[PDB]
Amino acid sequence: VYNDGYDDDNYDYIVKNGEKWMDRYEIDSLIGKGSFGQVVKAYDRVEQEWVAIKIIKNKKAFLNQAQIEVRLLELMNKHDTEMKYYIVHLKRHFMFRNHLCLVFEMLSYNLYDLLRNTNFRGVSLNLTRKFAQQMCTALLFLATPELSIIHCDLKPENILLCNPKRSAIKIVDFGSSCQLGQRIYQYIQSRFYRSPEVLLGMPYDLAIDMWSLGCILVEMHTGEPLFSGANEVDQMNKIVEVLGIPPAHILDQAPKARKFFEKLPDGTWNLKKTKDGKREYKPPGTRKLHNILGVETGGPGGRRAGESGHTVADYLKFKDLILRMLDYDPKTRIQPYYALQHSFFKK
Numbered sequence: 001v002y003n004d005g006y007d008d009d010n011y012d013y014i015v016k017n018g019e020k021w022m023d024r025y026e027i028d029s030l031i032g033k034g035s036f037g038q039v040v041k042a043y044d045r046v047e048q049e050w051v052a053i054k055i056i057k058n059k060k061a062f063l064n065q066a067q068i069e070v071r072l073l074e075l076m077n078k079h080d081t082e083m084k085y086y087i088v089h090l091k092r093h094f095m096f097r098n099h100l101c102l103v104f105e106m107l108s109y110n111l112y113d114l115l116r117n118t119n120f121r122g123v124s125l126n127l128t129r130k131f132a133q134q135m136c137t138a139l140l141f142l143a144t145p146e147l148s149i150i151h152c153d154l155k156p157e158n159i160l161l162c163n164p165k166r167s168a169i170k171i172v173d174f175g176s177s178c179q180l181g182q183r184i185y186q187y188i189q190s191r192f193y194r195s196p197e198v199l200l201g202m203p204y205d206l207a208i209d210m211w212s213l214g215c216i217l218v219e220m221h222t223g224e225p226l227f228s229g230a231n232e233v234d235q236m237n238k239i240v241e242v243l244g245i246p247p248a249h250i251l252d253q254a255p256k257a258r259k260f261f262e263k264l265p266d267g268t269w270n271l272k273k274t275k276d277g278k279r280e281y282k283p284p285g286t287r288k289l290h291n292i293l294g295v296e297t298g299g300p301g302g303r304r305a306g307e308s309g310h311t312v313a314d315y316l317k318f319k320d321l322i323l324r325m326l327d328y329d330p331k332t333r334i335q336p337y338y339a340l341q342h343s344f345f346k347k
């Protein structure tokens, strides 16, 4: 009763292994799912290459958003620069059985799979650096004025390895993306990677991607999310544990400041008063990134003690860059061009 029997109750195409489409594509298997729909592995008989096909949900709101993704991908992939190869390449798109289908190059595991394969011990600081440099270069590409693209959903699952035994990466899923000034959503970003300005209901720009990247890089080395909030209130409190109360010049302009904070008569802000004798969070700023990263105690959990490429000086450089990426103020948060100049990247 859904799309003549081709769809499930969640607007998704019921993927059937081995099905051939349009005498060109042989569907092998479902490889990933998302809010957008599904991504399947398939062989293109015409070009004689394996491809990934993103099958968008047969629902107007999802189709229309995927149209934005198509426009931004074609705009990015057309751009004459070698920086465009940290973005996944959209080969072509078509409508099949009332589903928008986007054909991409086939890619390998994402950065979450990589973390799980180390049993959440985290990858080395050297590999984290390689991911960080590629991502900063990618964000520099997005920041080019003709593009001005905010990805809006950076997370480990959206950063994929080209090849499973190499460190080259590509960004995927521009389905939440927008260009600067063309922003159409207030509830965006995956929660663990959600910026303060988005939590505060404030206007946002490309700097929210730099916030997400800073969260991602800590997680890549420690194995666990830096701010693992269960909801927005919990998310903001976890940020405050590490970074303190946000500055008054931000909260004074934040529409949703009273969802998390309270303004005192002197004009300074504090967390909202908790009920009864309930202690749940560390006091503001006392959960130090210095200790989360184990800068002077052998890395995260002490698990890197004595290894090369994990010196105290290396960790201090890494911490400083992360703190520059996690600046509360979007106007002073480190920008991609300057991030690439940081001492953490020097040979």
Ligand SMILES: N#Cc1c(C2CCCC2)[nH]c2c(I)cccc12
Binding pocket: 031, 032, 033, 034, 039, 052, 054, 088, 104, 105, 106, 107, 108, 157, 158, 172, 173, 174
């Ligand atoms: N959007 C997207 C893409 C995803 C999803 C990310 C979350 C679930 C799967 N996997 C892809 C591959 I393999 C190649 C190209 C694009 C994508």
